[model samples]
Target: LGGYMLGSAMSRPIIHFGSDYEDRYYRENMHRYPNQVYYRPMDEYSNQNNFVHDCVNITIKQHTVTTTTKGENFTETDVKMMERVVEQMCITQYERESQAYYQR
Candidate 1:
């Protein structure tokens, strides 16, 4: 069952909620945000040709977590475990995509 679950986790699609420009803007201004654990200070950065900023005003969308349950089909613990796995999958997936973007 663990192998089957791992296979599905690796194969499933993840939803990323932003335009390419929006994601790039966030990546550039990453240091200004408090919870951006992956940001490095400007002096420490290299290879990138120039520094960029958020030049235009834009609306910020808050992160959201949505879930569904089949009520009696799952016990309380079962639902919690399922949601936890989904949450971990999503978190790791964004990190993968975020780092992969820098390679281009």
Candidate 2:
């Protein structure tokens, strides 16, 4: 082969948190793992005996979310994603909330 080598590749499952999650790792942390930067491998869905679930919920045995290479407490912005993911659960809620204001 002219300047070429044959090799094998590996596969896996993954999920990331935060908007910068993709770059903060790999590009800044690991090496070629971004290709594996991926989740929902089991694809939870309702199939039997239930009331109508609009979007539904899921059960995860174990999953991890990280904010930094070093273990650290996440600040407001890093943690507020909950405000969007669970609007009903967020007492203040988005309609009355802003990036700088969280009703208490």
Worst 10 residues of 1 by lDDT: 52-61
Residue 32 in candidate 2, Cα distance off native in Å: 20
Q: What is the per-residue lDDT of model 2 for residues 1-104, given as tens digits with 9 covering 90 to 100? A: 13322112223222345556643542343332211111111124322212111111110001113334347455554333322222222212212223333543
Error of 1 at 1 (Å): 26
Give me the runs in candidate 2 sitting further than 4 Å from their true place: 1-70, 88-104
lDDT digits (tens) for residues 1-104 of candidate 1 = 01111111243222233456644544464343223112222234322212111100010111111222322343444333333334434444344445756896
Q: Using Cα atoms with residue i matched to residue i, what is each candidate's TM-score against the true structure? A: 0.32, 0.18
The local distance difference test score of each candidate is 0.30, 0.26
Runs of candidate 1 exceeding 4 Å displacement: 1-72
Using TM-score as the measure, the top candidate is 1
